[PDB]
Amino acid sequence: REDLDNYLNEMGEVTADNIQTWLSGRILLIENAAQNIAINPEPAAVASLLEQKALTSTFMASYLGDATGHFTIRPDAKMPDGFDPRVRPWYKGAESSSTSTLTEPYIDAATGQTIISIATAAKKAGQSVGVVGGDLSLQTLINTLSARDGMGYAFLVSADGKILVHPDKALVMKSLKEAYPQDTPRISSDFSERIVNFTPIKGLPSVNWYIGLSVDKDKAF
């Protein structure tokens, strides 16, 4: 048991570091996008920035919304009638953060897919000029986790217990209790009766997220 605990802990730390280092490169691209837009926030300049291959190859789309409701998105897309960027979770979350942020999964207004967004406020010498966001699909996050490793699966859960990414998509945005009503695992401890442990992801901006490692117990050696 000491041996399995030591290994799950070590695997959790590995998986956690790597997803942190997958995310933080993508967080830099958005921050750089926001910084460059703050240079020249004319919508022509904005649109040429978002059309660049480093962004379009990395994200489903990236975009700028501002306090008047103006919205520029690339690749371009017809947004639903009455779409307002200011009421979307990426906008509200970047507004209330002095750093960049990452949203919990939500329903993309463009694709209708489930997505998360990296967003940060774009600031021109103290003044906000809007919020820049980039979108990653839930399926992308599942694939990025399931690529990161021996015995069970990794999933991602917020500190408050909300399951964010899980290879069982039915469990996405269920709380731990709602997903696991009989004997609920607790983040508060780092082992739970499958055996499950939680490893904090360090160094993300604005969020407190955990890697959960879930392994078939008796198969584990």
Ligand code: PRO
């Ligand atoms: O759904 C949203 O709010 C973001 C912005 C447009 C595309 N995805």
Ligand SMILES: [Cl-]
């Ligand atoms: Cl990559």
Ligand SMILES: [Cl-]
């Ligand atoms: Cl446009």
